[PDB]
């Protein structure tokens, strides 16, 4: 089953997490990085990712 | 119109009764009756063991009401149990009694004579039992027991006599039991007397 939850761009001293929150639900839940759209993964959203 | 009213409120009772038969298989569910008044109905069940039907201090009738109101109609129900009118003149109790006795392990001849003696004791005019299944063999059979007057055809032998049927599952197969009791007041047309002076 391995391990995969990382690369939420992060260093020491400060953080600016890679992917934004979700505008649909409350904040905290992230979006996709497919490369063409922020699919939002579960709620449906195709803003042609900014 | 109005017929669609009469034969929509006659079916609900059929379904309720046909379900409670199964559910109160033991404790000899005798029959029910719905009294439809304003603001809700009221159900009555003449069991043969108020204890088992009620529950352990009322922990079953709750389920009975919720089930009888969620899956059936009867928007405001109120159940209560009672005791049988005449358990020895109601065929559809003797049928289940004999079926239970059979599937507990008694031989099929002791049960029938027990039952007939009890019935003709409590004051019936005539009774007839008829058992038929795979008893004592692998080719089925049939047997008959009777006691007195009992009408079979015509109009009088459709409304006066009381008849009931049951099953009794076993390790070999099933067995059908069919009883028929005559209430102690027959009064066939032939019984003409002379009011004298």
């Amino acid at each position: 089953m391995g391990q995969k939850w990382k690369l939420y761009i992060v260093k020491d001293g400060k953080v600016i997490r890679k992917n934004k929150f979700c505008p649909r639900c409350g904040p905290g839940v992230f979006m996709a990085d497919h490369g063409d759209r922020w699919a939002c993964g579960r709620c449906g959203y195709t803003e042609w990712k900014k | 119109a109005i017929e669609r009213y009469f034969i929509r409120e006659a079916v609900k009772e059929m379904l309720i009764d046909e379900f409670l038969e199964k559910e109160l298989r033991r404790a000899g569910y005798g029959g029910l009756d719905i009294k439809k008044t304003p603001l809700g109905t009221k159900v009555i069940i003449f069991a043969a063991n108020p204890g088992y039907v009620i529950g352990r201090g009322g922990r079953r009738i709750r389920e009975l009401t919720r089930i009888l109101e969620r899956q059936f109609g009867l928007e405001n129900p109120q159940i209560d149990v009672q005791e049988i009118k005449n358990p020895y003149l109601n065929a559809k109790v003797q049928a289940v009694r004999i079926a239970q006795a059979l599937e507990r392990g008694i031989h099929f001849r002791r049960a029938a004579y027990a039952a007939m003696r009890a019935i003709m004791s409590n004051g019936a005019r005539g009774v007839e039992i008829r058992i038929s299944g795979k008893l004592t063999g692998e080719r089925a059979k049939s047997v008959r027991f009777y006691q007195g007057y009992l009408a079979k055809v015509g109009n009088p032998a459709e409304t006066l006599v009381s008849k009931g049927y049951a099953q009794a599952l076993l390790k070999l197969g099933v067995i059908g039991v069919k009883v028929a009791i005559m209430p102690p007041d027959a009064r066939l047309p032939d019984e003409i007397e002379i009011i004298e002076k």
Binding site: - | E3, R4, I7, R8, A10, M14, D17
Partner: protein, 55 residues
């Protein structure tokens, strides 16, 4: 979705639109004045539904 492969379709006519209220079969079902039963169950429940046979 594993709830999209054992779920039926909502018919509203044809022999598969109605089933007996007590047995559960499609086919010969009575629709006169509303009650919805087989031709086989109506025959062994009728004298408790109120009916009688005069002729």
């Amino acid at each position: 979705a594993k709830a999209d492969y054992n779920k039926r379709k909502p018919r509203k006519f044809g022999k598969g639109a109605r089933r007996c209220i007590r047995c559960g079969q499609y086919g010969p079902i009575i629709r006169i004045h509303g009650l919805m039963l087989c031709r086989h169950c109506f025959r062994e429940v009728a004298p408790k539904l109120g009916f009688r046979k005069y002729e």
